[PDB]
Amino acid sequence: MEVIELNKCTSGQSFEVILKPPSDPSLEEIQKKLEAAEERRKYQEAELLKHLAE
Amino acid sequence: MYTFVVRDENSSVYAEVSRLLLATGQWKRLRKDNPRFNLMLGERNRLPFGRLGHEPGLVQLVNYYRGADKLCRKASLVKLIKTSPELSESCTWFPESYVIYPTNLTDEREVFLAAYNRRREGREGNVWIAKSSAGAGILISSEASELLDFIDEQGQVHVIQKYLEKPLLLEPGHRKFDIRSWVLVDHLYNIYLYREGVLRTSSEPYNSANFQDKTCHLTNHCIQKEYSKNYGRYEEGNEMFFEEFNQYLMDALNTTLENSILLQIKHIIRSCLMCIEPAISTKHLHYQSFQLFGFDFMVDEELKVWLIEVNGAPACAQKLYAELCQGIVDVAISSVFPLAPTSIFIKLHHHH
Amino acid sequence: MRECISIHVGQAGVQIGNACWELYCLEHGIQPDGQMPSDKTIGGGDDSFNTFFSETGAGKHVPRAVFVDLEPTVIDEVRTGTYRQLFHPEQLITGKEDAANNYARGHYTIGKEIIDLVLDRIRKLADQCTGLQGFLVFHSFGGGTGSGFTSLLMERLSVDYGKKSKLEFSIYPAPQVSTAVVEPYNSILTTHTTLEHSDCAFMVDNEAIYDICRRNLDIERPTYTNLNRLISQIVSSITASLRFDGALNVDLTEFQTNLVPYPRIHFPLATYAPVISAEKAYHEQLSVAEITNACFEPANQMVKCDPRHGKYMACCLLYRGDVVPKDVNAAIATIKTKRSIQFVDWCPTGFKVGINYQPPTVVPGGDLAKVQRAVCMLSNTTAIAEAWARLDHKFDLMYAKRAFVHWYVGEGMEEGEFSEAREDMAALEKDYEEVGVD
Amino acid sequence: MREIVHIQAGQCGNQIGAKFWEVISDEHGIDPTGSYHGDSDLQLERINVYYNEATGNKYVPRAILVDLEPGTMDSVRSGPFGQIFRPDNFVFGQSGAGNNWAKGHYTEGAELVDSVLDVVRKESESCDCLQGFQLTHSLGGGTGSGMGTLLISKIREEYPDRIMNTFSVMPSPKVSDTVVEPYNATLSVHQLVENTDETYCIDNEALYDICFRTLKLTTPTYGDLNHLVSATMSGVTTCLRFPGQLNADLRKLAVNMVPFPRLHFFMPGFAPLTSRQQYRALTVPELTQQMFDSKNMMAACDPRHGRYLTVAAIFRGRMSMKEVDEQMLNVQNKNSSYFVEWIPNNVKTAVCDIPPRGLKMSATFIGNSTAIQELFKRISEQFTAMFRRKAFLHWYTGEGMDEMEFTEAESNMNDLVSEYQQYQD
Ligand SMILES: Nc1nc2c(ncn2[C@@H]2O[C@H](COP(=O)(O)OP(=O)(O)OP(=O)(O)O)[C@@H](O)[C@H]2O)c(=O)[nH]1
Ligand SMILES: Nc1ncnc2c1ncn2[C@@H]1O[C@H](COP(=O)(O)OP(=O)(O)CP(=O)(O)O)[C@@H](O)[C@H]1O
Ligand SMILES: Nc1nc2c(ncn2[C@@H]2O[C@H](COP(=O)(O)OP(=O)(O)O)[C@@H](O)[C@H]2O)c(=O)[nH]1
Numbered sequence A: 001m002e003v004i005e006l007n008k009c010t011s012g013q014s015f016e017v018i019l020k021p022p023s024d025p026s027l028e029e030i031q032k033k034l035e036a037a038e039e040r041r042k043y044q045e046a047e048l049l050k051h052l053a054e
Numbered sequence B: 001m002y003t004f005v006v007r008d009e010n011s012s013v014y015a016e017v018s019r020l021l022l023a024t025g026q027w028k029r030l031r032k033d034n035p036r037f038n039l040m041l042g043e044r045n046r047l048p049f050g051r052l053g054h055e056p057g058l059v060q061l062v063n064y065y066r067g068a069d070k071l072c073r074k075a076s077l078v079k080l081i082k083t084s085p086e087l088s089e090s091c092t093w094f095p096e097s098y099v100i101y102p103t104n105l106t107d108e109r110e111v112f113l114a115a116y117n118r119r120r121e122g123r124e125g126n127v128w129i130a131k132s133s134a135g136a137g138i139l140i141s142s143e144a145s146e147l148l149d150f151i152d153e154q155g156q157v158h159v160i161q162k163y164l165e166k167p168l169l170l171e172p173g174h175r176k177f178d179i180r181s182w183v184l185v186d187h188l189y190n191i192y193l194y195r196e197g198v199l200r201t202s203s204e205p206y207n208s209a210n211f212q213d214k215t216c217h218l219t220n221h222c223i224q225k226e227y228s229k230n231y232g233r234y235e236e237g238n239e240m241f242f243e244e245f246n247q248y249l250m251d252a253l254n255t256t257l258e259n260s261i262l263l264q265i266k267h268i269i270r271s272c273l274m275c276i277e278p279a280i281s282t283k284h285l286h287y288q289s290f291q292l293f294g295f296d297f298m299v300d301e302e303l304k305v306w307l308i309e310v311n312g313a314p315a316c317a318q319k320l321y322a323e324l325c326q327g328i329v330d331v332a333i334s335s336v337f338p339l340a341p342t343s344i345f346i347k348l349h350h351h352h
Numbered sequence C: 001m002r003e004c005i006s007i008h009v010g011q012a013g014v015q016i017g018n019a020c021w022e023l024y025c026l027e028h029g030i031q032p033d034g035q036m037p038s039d040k041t042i043g044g045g046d047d048s049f050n051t052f053f054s055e056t057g058a059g060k061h062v063p064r065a066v067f068v069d070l071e072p073t074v075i076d077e078v079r080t081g082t083y084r085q086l087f088h089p090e091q092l093i094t095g096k097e098d099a100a101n102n103y104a105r106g107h108y109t110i111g112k113e114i115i116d117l118v119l120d121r122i123r124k125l126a127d128q129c130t131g132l133q134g135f136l137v138f139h140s141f142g143g144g145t146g147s148g149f150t151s152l153l154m155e156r157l158s159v160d161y162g163k164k165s166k167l168e169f170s171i172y173p174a175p176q177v178s179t180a181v182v183e184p185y186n187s188i189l190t191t192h193t194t195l196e197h198s199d200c201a202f203m204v205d206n207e208a209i210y211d212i213c214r215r216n217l218d219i220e221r222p223t224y225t226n227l228n229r230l231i232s233q234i235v236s237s238i239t240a241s242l243r244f245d246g247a248l249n250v251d252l253t254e255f256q257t258n259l260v261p262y263p264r265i266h267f268p269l270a271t272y273a274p275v276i277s278a279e280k281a282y283h284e285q286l287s288v289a290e291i292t293n294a295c296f297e298p299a300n301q302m303v304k305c306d307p308r309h310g311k312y313m314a315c316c317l318l319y320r321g322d323v324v325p326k327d328v329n330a331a332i333a334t335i336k337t338k339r340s341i342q343f344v345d346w347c348p349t350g351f352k353v354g355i356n357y358q359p360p361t362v363v364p365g366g367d368l369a370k371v372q373r374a375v376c377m378l379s380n381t382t383a384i385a386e387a388w389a390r391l392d393h394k395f396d397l398m399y400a401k402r403a404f405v406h407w408y409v410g411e412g413m414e415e416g417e418f419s420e421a422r423e424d425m426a427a428l429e430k431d432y433e434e435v436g437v438d
Numbered sequence D: 001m002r003e004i005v006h007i008q009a010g011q012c013g014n015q016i017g018a019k020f021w022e023v024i025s026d027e028h029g030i031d032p033t034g035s036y037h038g039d040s041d042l043q044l045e046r047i048n049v050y051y052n053e054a055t056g057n058k059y060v061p062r063a064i065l066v067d068l069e070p071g072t073m074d075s076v077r078s079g080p081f082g083q084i085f086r087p088d089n090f091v092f093g094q095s096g097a098g099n100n101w102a103k104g105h106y107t108e109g110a111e112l113v114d115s116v117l118d119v120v121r122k123e124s125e126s127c128d129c130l131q132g133f134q135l136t137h138s139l140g141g142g143t144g145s146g147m148g149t150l151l152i153s154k155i156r157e158e159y160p161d162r163i164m165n166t167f168s169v170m171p172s173p174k175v176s177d178t179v180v181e182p183y184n185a186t187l188s189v190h191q192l193v194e195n196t197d198e199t200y201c202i203d204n205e206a207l208y209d210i211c212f213r214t215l216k217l218t219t220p221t222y223g224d225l226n227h228l229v230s231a232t233m234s235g236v237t238t239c240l241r242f243p244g245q246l247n248a249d250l251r252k253l254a255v256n257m258v259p260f261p262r263l264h265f266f267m268p269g270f271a272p273l274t275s276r277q278q279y280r281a282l283t284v285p286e287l288t289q290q291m292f293d294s295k296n297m298m299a300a301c302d303p304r305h306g307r308y309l310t311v312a313a314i315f316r317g318r319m320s321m322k323e324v325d326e327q328m329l330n331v332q333n334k335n336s337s338y339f340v341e342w343i344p345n346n347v348k349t350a351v352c353d354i355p356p357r358g359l360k361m362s363a364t365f366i367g368n369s370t371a372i373q374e375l376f377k378r379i380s381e382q383f384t385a386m387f388r389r390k391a392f393l394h395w396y397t398g399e400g401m402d403e404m405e406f407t408e409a410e411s412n413m414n415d416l417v418s419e420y421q422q423y424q425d
């Protein structure tokens, strides 16, 4: 049961008590994800419009 | 109307509880994966406690205490007893045991040898027994070399505890035995001892000069009904109930089962379950638990009771399934989900 | 002094953000019009509260916050609410129609069209900071915007602000206060793509907040106002060190340093006490021991789980009010002799303690009662993995039948992202079992 | 501002649509002339969802009235609230459709469809953020069935990402006008399976049985049947028309109610349904029990013959929101064999403080149940009894159709049935 690093100021204090010692994607790659998904949506919609045109 | 699911089809105990629950006309069984259950008869291994108590508006109850393995594992029970001040390493009713990991993998190898070397020099009986939870594989021997060499040939954690060389022998027969007590802890953590125990007796005369023939030293029902030649001679199925064992103690030793043995059994059960109560209690939890325990005891020639092990998924004696399973429904299930005596249990009152 | 920018995404993030900044103003003596009389340095200053508030020449203290929602109805409240004058228009960003509880819609379809705008509004706040620490991001797991746009925003923030910490305050989905069946999908999708971008995330389970409101506050059917006011108290306890004089958790970096040993295991459990009903005739004020012991009762945790059956990697005690170190250590001694507190062998068995003498502030007329002292414990426990298991299980039930998947594929998401995200959650669960179990 | 454009087509579609606007206009305080005369701001909170605000505080329904014969729309224009509709929004022909799906879809309807779209286009352009469309129609006639589905297909071409919602009256031999109704209904179901996002299946037989057995009406009329449809349409749209939590837009509803795109046909229900013992208060348990009882359902499908994929329940009035949650969880936790267990928490509940006119409280039920397959089995059986002998086909081949088109519609509807049956298991 030890206390260490007691810091005291006007608005409070902090300390530590030890009880026992031990024993990314780039801007470019993101743009591709978003545009790849947008393209798959456009493909799906074009197939629907094709279906409707038939 | 209540709902329950079945997740352990091999449980002869809860197969009857399930049979009784349906027969009440007020319980309904659901598919094993349906989460809208009130009661779970869960699996033995890897029971998904983390998914209980999160169904809005459903009071959920399970038939196992999370964390009870600490008591029902050979190595865990040893570590729990030596490390818990409530039990302490001075615990007088538990045999001197040690946790021993095979050399192919903490461990208590040297500590065991120190005590072992102590007995050999003091001319005292130095017979031990090594075992493990992964067995149906037991070896009794008075030589330390054979105990450790047997564990290295395996690959799971083992424990070596002193073999009770002076056990109590029933007459006529000169035979060993063990006592099985059933204990039900409910959601409130009341400890209930079923009034009916059973002794699993050995139909072979005990022989302290030959541990090789393990039929007269091990009192298990499968070993006696398979490798023993006197099965069912004295009592039906090598099972003697309390009414007979008590009368015997009065005619032979002029003492009752309650005074000479039951008091120590009730003490051991209380000590163990009160110790782990802070760790497993579901008092302030989002779900509730109860569990049936099977305590196994040994009795020596001085009428001192020893704790052998605790089983978390125990079976029951054929003649007692009805009474006990109805008792489970009454105090464990219906106590939480009431329906629309002279209890068969003995409440072991304690300070929660 | 180093600045922290708060970002509130989706309905949950915005309304929770609304509650926090209300509390921040009351704690720092800031009025709804933006004025702060106690601030003697007009039009500037590098005080502790300036980490969360900028200052104009007219003496207005403006939150360093960005509110973002793909639908306008929630942010329109702030624009005409009690605190309309605190924010200027650039801080409140709203779209035309929401993501319909569809991660793929908020992330791909709608996110792609508004992400550059949000960054430019955030970039503006960053230009007012002389030393930006990082970001605090509030969002729900289950909303389409809260889950979908947040993950996209986090990736971009790592690109534009590579050397900045990012903390999360995430609302874990509870069926009692949600009418959305697909939230298990949205939670796992957003956790998968956000995981490597979040340094420390405080999950708040709506189920836990709901039951605390019914049990302690005697609210039969709590509303979002009841939940968010309680959530803001906990958030306020966690951000207090950044806004007040102190030496513990003084910058966002210290949250990872103290609470996160491994990058993926960055979900500390929060516990708060005491929660007392204001309608109580009068309550017996609790001591340091009683409120500290309460930090180990599951009923006060932000996520229902059983820490008795996990292992601890770190533990922070954040006290507010009449608390002196003597009574703290006395209570800790009494708790190690009764509680099941199992630490991992590779971590010290200890507690970092912070004390702020100013007791918790409570919104006038709110539900919470004034207490002389309160504490919020931040503990990194393997037991919080119970919440991943629950979520992952619900995910598996629906995904086995591919239920609702067509909504996500219909927004341009490939089905494989489901299994990729699910397999990553399976990895997360394994990491917790390796750390906690023997 | 999440506006919805309402379309009503054909005789049935316009008579049910007329009563709908009559009911909700009353709830929002709009009189027959469009002027507001309520007393609670809740009546205007979401009023712009279904009403356009014209000059002088006048509220004009965002509704388009379509028919191939003038008869029925003359009635509406002379009905109770006839004056409230935008005169330009009456689009009609003179020849009629003769209960002939082919006339509504290919010949007569084709000639008139473009002018209907011009009005749809005008209404959409005046919406801040259009949610989508709702259409009232029957499936057993010619205009609502044939031209109605033609409109949907052409609306999809121009607003592909908007929601398309229908209230579709399914024919029954018990409330029948002509023998060709199974033909017309099967051709329409084919369209609906592909081109709607949500379809409320309203079976005229269930409406009849309710009026006869429950309401004790000796001789039910179309007027009586339409009273039930009015109350049901008002209930299902309560989430949209009054301040309700969870936002409640048609797109979130579809996302959480439709786990598979083709399985978007709902069973609606309403409580109370009392016969003139009508002043008695109805407790929350009673509301819940009735709302889940098959007799209170408009699709004439026994929910106990299938399973619920998802369920939405809207309670109206000032009641115990705690007692609601208790009873809803009670009905679930007492019949969990009729809810699929692979969609967690698939029963959601919403409360609204404003009750319907003349009721202290009420409950509307929206179910996505696999038991709806029995409705399509009925139609399929009636269809095949005639089609195997090619009876009455000349009415359709005379308008340019080929038998193959019937065989395909039949196969798609039977596939829909098989698809329901697999998820029921
Ligand atoms: N605690 C709390 N939870 C909320 C609040 N608002 C919404 N939620 C939860 O958030 C989840 C729904 O996500 P939302 O935040 O409402 O959706 P969104 O982020 O706005 O995204 P959209 O789908 O586009 O609307 C549900 O689980 C709600 O219970 C709130 O104010 N407080
Ligand atoms: N320390 C000891 N001293 C004497 N006998 C012992 C002993 N440990 C075990 N035994 C013998 O072994 C038997 C119990 O074995 P144990 O219970 O450990 O194996 P097991 O768990 O596979 C059978 P169970 O079904 O009761 O759990 C008893 O009959 C007892 O006679
Ligand atoms: N519920 C209800 N059903 C109707 C009404 N009028 C017609 N029907 C049903 O609708 C079908 C006839 O279609 P109808 O609308 O008259 O044909 P249309 O004018 O060409 O679209 C038959 O199944 C009728 O039973 C009505 O007012 N209410």
Ligand SMILES: Fc1ccc(CNCc2ccccc2)cc1
Residues within 6 Å of the ligand: D174, D175, D176, D177, D208, D219, D220, D221, D222, D225
């Ligand atoms: F409830 C209803 C039951 C049956 C019907 C269909 N018959 C209407 C009719 C009857 C006789 C003369 C003219 C028309 C309509 C409604």
Ligand SMILES: Fc1ccc(CNCc2ccccc2)cc1
Residues within 6 Å of the ligand: C100, D152, D153, D155, D156, D157, D159, D160, D161, D162, D163, D164, D195, D196, D197, D250, D251, D252, D254
């Ligand atoms: F929430 C939504 C769910 C589904 C959709 C798909 N709309 C299809 C359609 C559009 C117009 C007319 C007919 C069909 C759109 C929104």
Ligand SMILES: [Ca+2]
Residues within 6 Å of the ligand: C039, C040, C041, C042, C043, C044, C045, C046, C047, C055
């Ligand atoms: Ca200043």
Ligand SMILES: [Ca+2]
Residues within 6 Å of the ligand: A024, C158, C162, C196, C197
């Ligand atoms: Ca990073």
Ligand SMILES: [Ca+2]
Residues within 6 Å of the ligand: D111
């Ligand atoms: Ca013509």
Ligand SMILES: [Mg+2]
Residues within 6 Å of the ligand: B309, B311
């Ligand atoms: Mg055993």
Ligand SMILES: [Mg+2]
Residues within 6 Å of the ligand: C010, C011, C071, C098, C143, C145
């Ligand atoms: Mg939203």
Ligand SMILES: [Mg+2]
Residues within 6 Å of the ligand: D011, D012, D141, D177
């Ligand atoms: Mg007609």
